[PDB]
Design a protein around this ligand. Structure first.
Ligand SMILES: [Ca+2]
Length: 139
Protein backbone atom coordinates (compact mmCIF):
# COMPACT_ATOMS: atom_id res chain seq x y z
CA UNK A 1 0.00 0.00 0.00
CA UNK A 2 1.48 3.32 -1.17
CA UNK A 3 1.20 6.54 0.85
CA UNK A 4 -0.58 9.33 -1.07
CA UNK A 5 0.65 12.93 -1.53
CA UNK A 6 -1.20 14.04 1.65
CA UNK A 7 0.40 11.25 3.72
CA UNK A 8 -2.65 8.95 3.94
CA UNK A 9 -2.40 5.17 3.48
CA UNK A 10 -5.34 3.77 1.48
CA UNK A 11 -7.16 0.87 3.20
CA UNK A 12 -10.34 -1.19 2.85
CA UNK A 13 -12.62 -2.47 5.61
CA UNK A 14 -15.36 -5.11 5.64
CA UNK A 15 -18.56 -5.33 7.69
CA UNK A 16 -20.37 -8.63 7.05
CA UNK A 17 -23.90 -8.78 8.48
CA UNK A 18 -26.49 -11.55 8.65
CA UNK A 19 -30.28 -11.38 8.31
CA UNK A 20 -30.69 -11.07 12.11
CA UNK A 21 -28.63 -7.84 12.09
CA UNK A 22 -25.51 -9.32 13.69
CA UNK A 23 -22.08 -8.43 12.31
CA UNK A 24 -18.99 -10.58 11.87
CA UNK A 25 -15.55 -9.87 13.28
CA UNK A 26 -12.35 -11.90 13.18
CA UNK A 27 -9.06 -12.15 15.06
CA UNK A 28 -6.82 -9.59 13.32
CA UNK A 29 -3.77 -10.92 15.19
CA UNK A 30 -4.04 -13.67 17.82
CA UNK A 31 -6.14 -13.84 20.99
CA UNK A 32 -8.75 -11.16 21.82
CA UNK A 33 -7.86 -9.19 18.66
CA UNK A 34 -11.41 -9.25 17.28
CA UNK A 35 -11.79 -6.62 14.56
CA UNK A 36 -13.54 -6.13 11.23
CA UNK A 37 -11.42 -7.38 8.33
CA UNK A 38 -9.19 -4.59 7.07
CA UNK A 39 -6.23 -4.27 4.70
CA UNK A 40 -4.20 -2.05 2.41
CA UNK A 41 -5.07 -1.07 -1.14
CA UNK A 42 -2.10 -1.74 -3.44
CA UNK A 43 -1.05 0.21 -6.57
CA UNK A 44 -3.13 -0.35 -9.73
CA UNK A 45 -6.01 -1.81 -7.74
CA UNK A 46 -9.58 -0.72 -6.98
CA UNK A 47 -11.03 -0.75 -3.47
CA UNK A 48 -13.44 -3.51 -4.53
CA UNK A 49 -10.53 -5.69 -5.71
CA UNK A 50 -8.74 -5.10 -2.39
CA UNK A 51 -11.96 -5.93 -0.53
CA UNK A 52 -12.27 -9.36 -2.20
CA UNK A 53 -8.58 -10.05 -1.48
CA UNK A 54 -9.10 -9.27 2.22
CA UNK A 55 -12.35 -11.27 2.28
CA UNK A 56 -10.56 -14.35 0.92
CA UNK A 57 -7.54 -13.94 3.20
CA UNK A 58 -9.36 -13.19 6.47
CA UNK A 59 -12.65 -15.11 6.05
CA UNK A 60 -11.95 -17.68 3.29
CA UNK A 61 -14.85 -16.41 1.15
CA UNK A 62 -15.15 -15.10 -2.41
CA UNK A 63 -17.52 -12.91 -4.47
CA UNK A 64 -20.03 -15.77 -4.87
CA UNK A 65 -20.53 -16.01 -1.08
CA UNK A 66 -21.48 -12.37 -0.45
CA UNK A 67 -23.81 -9.59 -1.55
CA UNK A 68 -22.51 -6.01 -1.41
CA UNK A 69 -25.21 -3.96 0.34
CA UNK A 70 -23.31 -0.65 0.46
CA UNK A 71 -19.93 1.06 0.37
CA UNK A 72 -18.27 4.42 0.99
CA UNK A 73 -18.19 6.06 -2.46
CA UNK A 74 -15.42 8.46 -1.41
CA UNK A 75 -12.80 8.17 1.39
CA UNK A 76 -13.20 8.00 5.17
CA UNK A 77 -10.10 9.90 6.33
CA UNK A 78 -8.58 10.10 9.81
CA UNK A 79 -5.25 11.17 11.30
CA UNK A 80 -3.15 8.78 13.37
CA UNK A 81 -2.51 9.78 16.96
CA UNK A 82 0.88 11.54 16.68
CA UNK A 83 2.54 9.01 19.03
CA UNK A 84 1.63 6.17 16.61
CA UNK A 85 3.33 7.82 13.61
CA UNK A 86 6.53 6.27 12.25
CA UNK A 87 8.39 9.59 12.20
CA UNK A 88 11.78 8.26 10.99
CA UNK A 89 10.58 6.65 7.72
CA UNK A 90 9.94 8.66 4.55
CA UNK A 91 7.46 9.23 3.17
CA UNK A 92 5.76 9.70 6.55
CA UNK A 93 2.29 8.17 6.97
CA UNK A 94 0.09 10.47 9.08
CA UNK A 95 -3.28 8.73 8.62
CA UNK A 96 -5.47 6.36 6.65
CA UNK A 97 -8.03 6.95 3.93
CA UNK A 98 -10.53 4.11 4.06
CA UNK A 99 -13.27 2.63 1.91
CA UNK A 100 -15.69 0.40 3.84
CA UNK A 101 -17.99 -2.28 2.43
CA UNK A 102 -21.20 -3.62 3.97
CA UNK A 103 -21.74 -7.25 2.96
CA UNK A 104 -24.35 -9.90 3.67
CA UNK A 105 -23.86 -13.65 3.33
CA UNK A 106 -25.66 -15.28 0.41
CA UNK A 107 -14.81 -15.51 13.41
CA UNK A 108 -17.86 -14.67 15.57
CA UNK A 109 -21.22 -12.86 15.28
CA UNK A 110 -22.00 -9.90 17.57
CA UNK A 111 -24.70 -7.21 17.75
CA UNK A 112 -24.37 -4.46 15.11
CA UNK A 113 -23.32 -1.69 17.53
CA UNK A 114 -21.22 -3.90 19.85
CA UNK A 115 -17.91 -3.42 17.95
CA UNK A 116 -18.20 0.39 18.27
CA UNK A 117 -18.02 0.01 22.06
CA UNK A 118 -15.73 -3.03 22.30
CA UNK A 119 -13.04 -2.55 19.60
CA UNK A 120 -9.63 -1.25 20.74
CA UNK A 121 -9.74 2.44 21.72
CA UNK A 122 -7.83 3.50 18.57
CA UNK A 123 -10.58 2.33 16.18
CA UNK A 124 -13.71 3.28 18.16
CA UNK A 125 -14.30 6.64 16.42
CA UNK A 126 -13.75 5.13 12.94
CA UNK A 127 -16.11 2.26 13.78
CA UNK A 128 -18.74 4.74 15.03
CA UNK A 129 -18.52 6.68 11.75
CA UNK A 130 -18.72 3.49 9.65
CA UNK A 131 -21.68 1.94 11.50
CA UNK A 132 -23.55 5.28 11.52
CA UNK A 133 -23.20 5.52 7.71
CA UNK A 134 -24.36 1.93 7.19
CA UNK A 135 -27.30 2.48 9.58
CA UNK A 136 -29.08 4.37 6.77
CA UNK A 137 -28.92 1.15 4.70
CA UNK A 138 -30.12 -1.40 7.31
CA UNK A 139 -32.30 0.33 9.94
CA1 LIG B 1 -6.03 -7.90 6.80
Amino acid sequence: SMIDDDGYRPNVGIVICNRQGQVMWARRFGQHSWQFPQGGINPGESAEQAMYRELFEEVGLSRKDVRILASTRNWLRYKLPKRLVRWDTKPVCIGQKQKWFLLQLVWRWVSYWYPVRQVVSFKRDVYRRVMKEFASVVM
